[PDB]
Design a protein around this ligand. Structure first.
Ligand SMILES: [Cl-]
Ligand SMILES: [Cl-]
Ligand SMILES: [Cl-]
Ligand SMILES: [Cl-]
Ligand SMILES: [K+]
Ligand SMILES: [Mg+2]
Ligand SMILES: [Mg+2]
Ligand SMILES: [Mg+2]
Ligand SMILES: [Mg+2]
Ligand SMILES: [Mg+2]
Ligand SMILES: [Mg+2]
Ligand SMILES: [Mg+2]
Ligand SMILES: [Mg+2]
Ligand SMILES: [Mg+2]
Ligand SMILES: [Mg+2]
Ligand SMILES: [Mg+2]
Ligand SMILES: [Mg+2]
Ligand SMILES: [Mg+2]
Ligand SMILES: [Mg+2]
Ligand SMILES: [Mg+2]
Ligand SMILES: [Mg+2]
Ligand SMILES: [Mg+2]
Ligand SMILES: [Mg+2]
Ligand SMILES: [Mg+2]
Ligand SMILES: [Mg+2]
Ligand SMILES: [Mg+2]
Ligand SMILES: [Mg+2]
Ligand SMILES: [Mg+2]
Ligand code: NA
Ligand code: NA
Ligand code: NA
Ligand code: NA
Ligand code: NA
Ligand code: NA
Ligand code: NA
Ligand code: NA
Ligand code: NA
Ligand code: NA
Ligand code: NA
Ligand code: NA
Ligand code: NA
Ligand code: NA
Ligand code: NA
Ligand code: NA
Ligand code: NA
Ligand code: NA
Ligand code: NA
Ligand code: NA
Lengths: 95, 160, 92, 186
RNA sequence: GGUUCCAAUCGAAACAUGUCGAAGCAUGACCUCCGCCGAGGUAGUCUGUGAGGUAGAGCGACCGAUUGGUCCUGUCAAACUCCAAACUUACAGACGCCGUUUGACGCGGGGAUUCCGGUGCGCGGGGUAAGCCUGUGUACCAGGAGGGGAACAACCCAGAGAU
RNA sequence: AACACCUCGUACAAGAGGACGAAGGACCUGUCAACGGCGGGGGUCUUAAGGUAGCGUAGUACCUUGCCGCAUCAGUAGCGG
RNA sequence: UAGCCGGGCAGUUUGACUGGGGCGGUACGCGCUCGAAAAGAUAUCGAGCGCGCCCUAUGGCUAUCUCAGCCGGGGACCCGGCGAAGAGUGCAAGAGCAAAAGAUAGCUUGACAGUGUUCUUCCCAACGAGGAACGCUGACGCGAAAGCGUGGUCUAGCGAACCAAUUAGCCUGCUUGAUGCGGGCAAUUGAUGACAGAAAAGCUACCCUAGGGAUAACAGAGUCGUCACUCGCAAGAGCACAUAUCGACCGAGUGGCUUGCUACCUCGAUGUCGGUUCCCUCCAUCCUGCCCGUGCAGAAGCGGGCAAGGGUGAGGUUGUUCGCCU
RNA sequence: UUAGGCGGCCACAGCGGUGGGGUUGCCUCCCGUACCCAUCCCGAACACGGAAGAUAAGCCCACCAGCGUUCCGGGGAGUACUGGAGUGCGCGAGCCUCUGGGAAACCCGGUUCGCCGCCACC
């Protein structure tokens, strides 16, 4: 990498496909999750806030409470545990 | 310089003119020869020159072989004979040269070349059954001035 | 950049929003009686004098803002974090 | 439309029926909405909650089935509106609903409007709704006073289909009292 | 440059962050030893729920290149994409293997060595090239005998207590 | 600049400021048989001036075995211009 | 005792990176695309290019509204139509945004104080400053209200300890009280760009030591762009005639004499260039033997084939190799 | 849903087009400014009050595939590319066999002129 900012090499994963352009449906942004629940992490290009670090895109954590409207989701990066703050706009129920 | 320096495809595609400046002009005078106003389907016979190996051909070679083939068709059919040949390739790959030692070695722009996969037709001529032996000879001279071995192939022509 | 000489904002002293006046922190004179002033005299003699032989550093291309926010009613001042600015001029 | 790369708006956006930016902000409260909608002739009030496959309406009222309790006058006016809100508000209290947030759709927040009248009614019915008193029309205009004074400038009878001549804000009062009773069919 | 007896168990790193640092150190990674915890673990495969735009392809799908003729006709892309793999990867179940006297997974502490690497294969970037320079994944040499290859660190077979 | 003196400060002192002002410096002048300099452009510019007698391919000239002549069968040498 | 001058003398410093070192440059702190091999991570003096600010509005909320561009009617203005985004949004690049994140208008100062959770900085996996997301307490702005405002749509715009100045309150100074003047808890501002922070110029051929083939000159070795020689095609000219002879372009090669590249071998030493003497060899043949063609009358040539038995000498300038001259 | 309101998926729903339907019912157009409210100028819009008229717009219903989109058949194609293995071939750039996966363009033919949830209503 020529630089080391968070948006490095994120051209593909943080860009909307043309037909999905524009504002997203409020339904998933207001969704409610319970503790112990398994969720998939994926940033919505259209939603600016409630984002996590792009490296974590593609993970599958476990909801373990919340901090404000946002959620606290547990994950394991490589072999190290980490707790990620993220909104429902960037989350999906597993299974 | 020798073609040995650029004949193989051993580098990424370097064709983006938006990041490359000072690219030399092509030596290829014309791509559509003979009677460009007439149609390709207006001829009984159609022979193409097929490249046998996957290679890179510099604009210098394209001009030399195109020249020495059409020059024959003009000599045997006339400056306005009944035929039409086609050089169906354009030189897109830009070439460098490290012309200090290996320090800051990225080369400067020295030329252009067309990439041709084995099995592709470089040239394609269209003529009547009479002139069929002239087009073959014109192609014989043409494959003498480019790197790979070539197959002179007559596509629509069962008048052999 | 421009900045209003007076405006409304939180006064940490009254604990309620009030009009504050903005001024540029002037340098207070040195009494020359602090501990550092005494060590200079004590430790300086024949030859090199360590730290007391060094001279003034340098300059950054742009300095941050050095301001004093004064409350219009209780009259007390508070400081804030500064921001790099090539020039600052108050309005009115 | 034009090609593959083309963007077609969400259906309710093409239909000019849903303000999605306002809808989201509305949903953030976590409370059920009080859907205040009007028509040229009528008024409507729904209590909507969120659901897996689409909104769930828990209670509602229409200015048409208002007469079912005593109405005999027009339904596209102020008195009509308030009463429809109170009605809907009461059916809501009956379903176990306690609070709501006013959703006025693509209408304008003009002071003293019908959506606000609808809102006042539901508040009077016993629902906890975020409001602002000094935006609701004055009590008299809700009753239908402004309309009585209009026909006061008679010359040519206001109401075609006879309900009366000078009209009756009193009928409004009779209706309010009829609904405030606890027995009433809801 | 040198540092003197025998044997048994385990067995590296030639890399990352900071350094007047690059012939050196510290902190991690990795090797080893001790104590603690007490039931799961996941090197392989299958399936389910997710992540992705490289190969290839195509471009009247954007974008920028690139032909000729009186719609048709000729061509491209590391810093293009209407498309799109193999494959890599998160979580979970199932089978396999493994652990509950060989205590796994994990936690805490003592001790290091190490931070000149090299080669084959796959994918690379630079360079006319190189027994070149610089990445990456993997196995090997280094520290790997014995059989084969005329000889021969890394190519083939093969990992080896004695008889 | 320091001492002395004056103001403020301190029951005193530390300290702050002031008045006066030596050599030195700014400023001006003299000096190159003092260090050194003597160009580019055009028919002035840098930075003061812009190479005079002489000598010159030099033990100093890259181009260079410069060109002409002497001398030799032939002279990157040598001497003369 | 104070100010000026002061290499006469003393002690020291004068960085690192780097296809050896110096010169050049900064890949020495940061952001984006590509390189990067469709998770994450990834080098080179790798390709394209940026940041060390600017803004009191170019910040914030609300209301009202929809832009480029093209068409039609009266490249300023007015009316209508087409027009999902090509406009605009401070500045690189990539990404976001249309009843808005854009435009206009009006209002407002949340660019607010206090204290945290988390991620990043530093993938995995320890490490500061800095940064971001998301909360809580306090006080406010706007809106009918949900709600939005912890600066600018997102990723660059940054700085330790010591010391000083500054902000508000409080602790403290040797038996004790009063005064003066000090020491401290929290925090803001002042620079170290060699950017996880020393206060810092050169020469040595008079030289010296420790080491290194971890690294250059010379020789060897790899390569062969350069150099030497060859071949294919044969445009062309040669009074006509391509091929007696000369022979462009383009294409394919062989050698290892030149040159360049690389850094494998040697720095506890493989003695330099040129010359000389004396020995062996190669053929891409200068002569000599034997041949073929000719633009071969002859004679003298010119070009080509086989062929390494023998021969290939003397002198003038210059150290010259080379080369010029008799 | 014999015309309604709030939605989920967010073009299978877009673009364009044909036919049909409403007396005190519904939705509209519609009619009109004393009031609440409104236009940097206009009751155009926003807002309020109301039914003389209309089904021509919108809307709801049935339907057409020319463009765009979704999926599917056959063909392209087990082609291009590719994960594991080889004392297989080639001077070499490179190719081939075995094993496990597997495309895009394009042509032809079907499909698609939205589906689903809640509430109210002849
Ligand atoms: Cl995060
Ligand atoms: Cl300031
Ligand atoms: Cl409505
Ligand atoms: Cl083993
Ligand atoms: K040596
Ligand atoms: Mg990519
Ligand atoms: Mg001293
Ligand atoms: Mg031992
Ligand atoms: Mg033993
Ligand atoms: Mg490709
Ligand atoms: Mg990968
Ligand atoms: Mg070793
Ligand atoms: Mg002379
Ligand atoms: Mg000295
Ligand atoms: Mg010393
Ligand atoms: Mg160095
Ligand atoms: Mg990646
Ligand atoms: Mg922001
Ligand atoms: Mg210091
Ligand atoms: Mg200060
Ligand atoms: Mg540093
Ligand atoms: Mg750093
Ligand atoms: Mg020595
Ligand atoms: Mg070496
Ligand atoms: Mg010897
Ligand atoms: Mg021979
Ligand atoms: Mg011999
Ligand atoms: Mg009709
Ligand atoms: Na969207
Ligand atoms: Na250099
Ligand atoms: Na050839
Ligand atoms: Na002392
Ligand atoms: Na290393
Ligand atoms: Na180091
Ligand atoms: Na060292
Ligand atoms: Na490939
Ligand atoms: Na091994
Ligand atoms: Na052997
Ligand atoms: Na230094
Ligand atoms: Na931090
Ligand atoms: Na060499
Ligand atoms: Na060679
Ligand atoms: Na030796
Ligand atoms: Na010699
Ligand atoms: Na011979
Ligand atoms: Na000589
Ligand atoms: Na105005
Ligand atoms: Na309609």
């Amino acid at each position: 990498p020529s630089s080391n900012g968070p948006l490095e090499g994120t051209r593909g994963k943080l860009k909307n496909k043309p037909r999905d352009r524009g504002t997203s449906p409020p339904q998933r942004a207001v969704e409610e999750f319970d503790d112990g629940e398994k969720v998939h992490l994926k940033i919505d290009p259209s939603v600016p806030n409630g984002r996590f670090h792009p490296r974590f895109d593609g993970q599958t954590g476990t909801v373990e409470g919340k901090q404000g409207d946002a959620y606290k989701v547990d994950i394991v990066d490589g072999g190290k545990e980490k707790t990620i703050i993220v909104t429902a706009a960037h989350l999906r129920r597993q299974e | 310089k020798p073609a040995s320096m650029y004949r193989d495809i051993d580098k990424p595609a370097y064709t983006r003119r938006e990041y490359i400046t000072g690219i030399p002009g092509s030596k290829i005078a014309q791509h559509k020869m003979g009677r460009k106003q007439k149609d390709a389907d207006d001829y009984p016979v159609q022979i193409s020159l097929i490249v046998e190996e996957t290679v890179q051909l510099r604009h210098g070679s394209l001009e030399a072989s195109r020249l020495s083939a059409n020059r024959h068709l003009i000599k045997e059919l006339g400056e306005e004979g009944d035929y039409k040949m086609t050089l169906r390739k354009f030189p897109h790959q830009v070439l460098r040269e490290n012309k200090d030692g290996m320090r800051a070695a990225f080369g400067k722009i020295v030329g252009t070349a067309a990439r041709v996969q084995a099995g592709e037709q470089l040239f394609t001529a269209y003529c009547n059954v009479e002139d069929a032996e002239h087009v073959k000879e014109a192609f014989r001279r043409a494959y003498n001035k480019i790197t790979p071995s070539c197959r002179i192939d007559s596509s629509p022509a069962g008048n052999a | 950049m421009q900045m209003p000489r007076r405006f409304n904002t939180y006064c940490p002293h009254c604990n309620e929003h009030q009009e504050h006046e903005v001024e540029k922190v002037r340098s207070g004179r040195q009494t020359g009686m602090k501990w550092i002033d005494r060590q200079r005299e004590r430790n300086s003699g024949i030859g090199n004098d360590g730290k007391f032989s060094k001279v003034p550093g340098g300059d950054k291309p742009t300095k941050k803002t050095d301001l004093k926010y004064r409350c219009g009613e209780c009259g007390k001042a508070h400081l804030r974090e500064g921001w790099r600015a090539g020039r600052l001029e108050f309005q009115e | 439309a034009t090609g593959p790369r083309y963007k077609v708006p969400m259906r309710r956006r093409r239909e000019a029926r849903t303000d999605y930016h306002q809808r989201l902000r509305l949903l953030k409260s976590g409370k059920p909405r009080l859907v205040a909608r009007k028509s040229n002739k009528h008024v409507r009030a729904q209590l909507v909650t969120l659901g897996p496959n689409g909104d769930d309406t828990l209670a509602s009222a229409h200015s048409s089935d208002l007469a079912e309790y005593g109405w005999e006058a027009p339904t596209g006016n102020m008195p009509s509106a308030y009463l429809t809100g109170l009605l809907a508000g009461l059916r809501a209290q009956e379903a176990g609903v306690e609070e709501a947030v006013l959703d006025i759709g693509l209408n304008s927040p003009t002071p003293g409007s019908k959506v606000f009248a609808i809102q006042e009614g539901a508040i009077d019915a016993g629902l906890d709704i975020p409001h602002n008193d000094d935006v609701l029309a004055d009590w008299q205009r809700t009753r239908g006073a402004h309309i009585a004074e209009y026909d006061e400038q008679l010359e040519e009878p206001l109401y075609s289909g006879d309900f009366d001549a000078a009209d009756l804000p009193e009928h409004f009062d009779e209706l309010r009292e009829t609904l405030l009773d606890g027995d009433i069919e809801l």
